[model samples]
Each structure stands twice: as C-alpha cells, then as structure tokens.
Target: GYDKDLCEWSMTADQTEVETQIEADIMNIVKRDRPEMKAEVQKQLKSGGVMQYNYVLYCDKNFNNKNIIAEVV
Candidate 1:
C-alpha cells in the first residue's frame, strides 16, 4: 500500500468503484480483443510523485496476469 497526492479526487482499495472501473476497462478491452485469455489487473492513482506520474505492470513468468496501470490525471 502507498499514498500520493492527486489534483483531483483519489481512490484506493477502500474506493472499490474506481478500482473496479479501471480493472473492468482493461479486462473488457482484453476480452474483446483476446477472447480466450484471462487477466488479473490492478489499477492505482498517484499524484505529486517523483516522476510527475508513473505506472507499473506485473505478470507471471508466463505473463498471464493482467497489467497493472496507473495515472495521475
């Protein structure tokens, strides 16, 4: 778990809707593009961080997990 400032409203695990929205968007797109694949995605938002904004993605050796994406805007 981590914390960062946001110019706009922010959301975390406690903020399930934001999490769900982000996750769903990625998964839905993937499902549409890759119907036979499965993914587990995580979404995060950070503001006022070292790089202005950044995102990190993780996956298993087989690269089966969903991409973890983040944004500052």
Candidate 2:
C-alpha cells in the first residue's frame, strides 16, 4: 500500500512504447523551453535508468513557496 499523504510515480527511458513517447514529449518540451539544458538533459535521458523520471507529490502544512523545481538526472 502507498501513503495517501505522499505518493510517487516514475517512467523510464527504455520502457513500453507509450513510456518512450511520453519521455520523448517531455524532452521535446524541455529542449524547446530550456535550450541550455538540452545536452545535459539528453545525456540523462539516454542513461536508461528505471528511476529516470521519478516524481513525488505530497502535502505540506507549513510550506510556502511559489517556485517549481525541475531536474534531469
């Protein structure tokens, strides 16, 4: 079972066709928006790690911020 307050999901570079397409789309968007990170992002994407695109979302009672953090590695 997973915790309701905090959960995680992930997609890999060498998974199903659907997963591959999803990763591709993500990379495309990244390249379009952040050209400086294209090379490094592509390197990480090609690493073929299962946790390549791991993501976590949770509730924070005292959290106060408007910034979004994005990473590729």
Candidate 3:
C-alpha cells in the first residue's frame, strides 16, 4: 500500500547554524516517531568560503510525512 503525504522542506535563513538547528529539530521528531528510520536520516553542511552555506538532508521514504524547517544564522 502507498499513500501520498505532504512533507515540508523549508530553509528560512542563510546561515549554517540555522540550517543545522532545523535539521536537529527534524531529527528529534524522527527519533520520537520513526525510530526505525533514525539511522537512515543524514544531514550535511557545505560552506562557500565564508560567503554562503548549504545544507543537505536525506531521509528514507518513511520520513515523507514529516516537515523540515531551517533558518540561517
């Protein structure tokens, strides 16, 4: 069986710290509701020599029902 759910992915700030904070928040939720998938969730932060920061996150299909919110600091 398959179902379609609207999982939210958003970045509100352009700071690496902000993005990481949001990523952590999402992880906590995943840990609580989806412990089985906690290990599959991954997050990465990229810096462009003090100019820009990029955050990338990957989660299994089961996490599609969750929301991701990030803020740059």
Candidate 4:
C-alpha cells in the first residue's frame, strides 16, 4: 500500500482525467463559436498565458477589449 499520509484513495476517477475532460469540453465550446481564435489562444498558451472558463466567457463577451486581453496575457 502507499503511504497513508500521502495518499487519500477514492472510488472516483483520477484528477488528471477529470481535468483533461474539462479542458476538452471547454475547447470544444470555444471552437464552436470562433474557430479561428483557437490559433491565437494556443499561441497565448504557448507564450505562458493563463486561461480558465471565466476568462473564455469574458473574452467571448468582450471580444474587442484589448486592455483586458493584454492584462490576461
């Protein structure tokens, strides 16, 4: 068995699996609307940018907000 203090087991799926699924779902939605933005988003991600669900929603709502986008990057 693993170290008791370091491991808390559960019947649920692994955390990485959940995170991967969530990211896939979010990207799916993003692609659905503005297919072209994916390239820019990927570029941002590669350049050490951070993005979350709320960030995506905010960008979608305020597509032209250069200041906010700059802040996010």
Candidate 5:
C-alpha cells in the first residue's frame, strides 16, 4: 500500500472570481476547527518568466506547514 497520496488533476476557475473563492475556501477549513488558517501568494518563473503561482495554506501547530494546493490560470 502507498504511504502517501500524490494526487494532482485539473480544474478551471474564472479569473474574475477565483481569488474570492480561494478566500472563502480557506475560511471554510477554519470552520472545521482549524485555528488561525492563513494563505500566501507567491509568483515565480516556470520558464522564461512564465508565471507560476504558489498559493500556500498554513495553520496552527497541529497543522504544521505544507503546500496544500495551488492553481494557475
């Protein structure tokens, strides 16, 4: 059996409202008892400065830190 899951797939979000959706979804996790949930946005060059966004999610001590998920439009 696998010790961990490496799941990746594709989804589309409207650039017009995707940022707002990110905020609401992060808060939704806090609603599940995750204290002090927070998010960060960073950009890097994938190749030749093509934009790649890193939307990192953080939480309390119990949650530690990891790249929760990220998306690019």
Candidate 6:
C-alpha cells in the first residue's frame, strides 16, 4: 500500500463494532502524538458492500489537520 498520512484504520473489515474500535484507536493514536487534538467519530461514508457501516475520525471542524498518521506507524 502507498505510504502516507491522513489515512484510515480498518478492522479486517467491519460491521460497525470493529470500526468503533478503530475510532478509539484513532483517538488514542492521535492523542498520543497530538495531545492538543481530539477524536470525534462521525458515521460518514456509505460505499458498496464490505465495511459499509464505516466512520471517520474528526479532531477539528474547520481544519483539515484533524486526521494524520504519526511516527510512521
């Protein structure tokens, strides 16, 4: 996969519960790096099958720097 930030964290494919886990993981990870930030899980995006019940993490409303991968993990 291409390496980059502002990425997503999946759960081997989810049905909502797993994505919820990822949401907290995203929160923990982001808080670990950017303590000044926050994590807000939004039930956004409805694509085809597989992980259709997805969500996105949001730290800031007006800023695009809310989602980011830190420490190259």
What value does the lDDT take at residue 11 in candidate 5?
24
Q: Whose lDDT is greatest here?
A: 2
Candidate 5, RMSD to the unseen true structure: 10.2
lDDT of 1 by residue, 1-73 (tens): 1224321233333455445444554456456655444332222232232121212222123322233232211
After TM-score superposition, the amount by which residue 11's alpha carbon in candidate 5 deviates from its true location, in angstroms, is: 4.3
Backbone Cα, N, C clashes tallied per candidate: 1, 0, 2, 0, 0, 0
**Model 6 compared with the native: what TM-score?**
0.36
Q: Candidate 3, residues 1-73: lDDT per residue as tens digits?
A: 0122211233334456555654565567667766555544533223213212223233235333343322221
What are the runs in model 6 whose C-alpha is more than 4 Å off?
Answer: 1-14, 39-73
Ranking under TM-score, best-scoring first? 2, 4, 3, 6, 1, 5
Clashing pairs in 3: 13-72, 15-72
lDDT of 5 at 46: 23
How does each model score on TM-score? 0.33, 0.45, 0.39, 0.39, 0.31, 0.36
RMSD of 2: 7.3
Model 1 residue 4 lDDT score = 41
* CA lDDT of every candidate: 0.34, 0.43, 0.39, 0.42, 0.30, 0.38
Q: What lDDT does candidate 5 reach at residue 45? A: 18
Compose the digit string of candidate 5's lDDT tens values, residues 1-73: 1112211111244543444544444345444544333332212212212111212322122332222322221
True lDDT of residue 36, candidate 3: 58
Global Cα lDDT for candidate 6: 0.38
CA shift of 26, model 1, Å = 1.3
RMSD of each: 12.1, 7.3, 9.9, 11.8, 10.2, 10.1
**5 or 6, greater by lDDT:** 6
Q: Give the TM-score of candidate 1.
A: 0.33
Mark the regions of model 2 whose C-alpha exceeds 4 Å error after superposition. Answer: 1-14, 48-69
Native-to-model Cα distance after best TM-score fit, residue 37 in candidate 5, in Å: 4.4
lDDT, model 2: 0.43
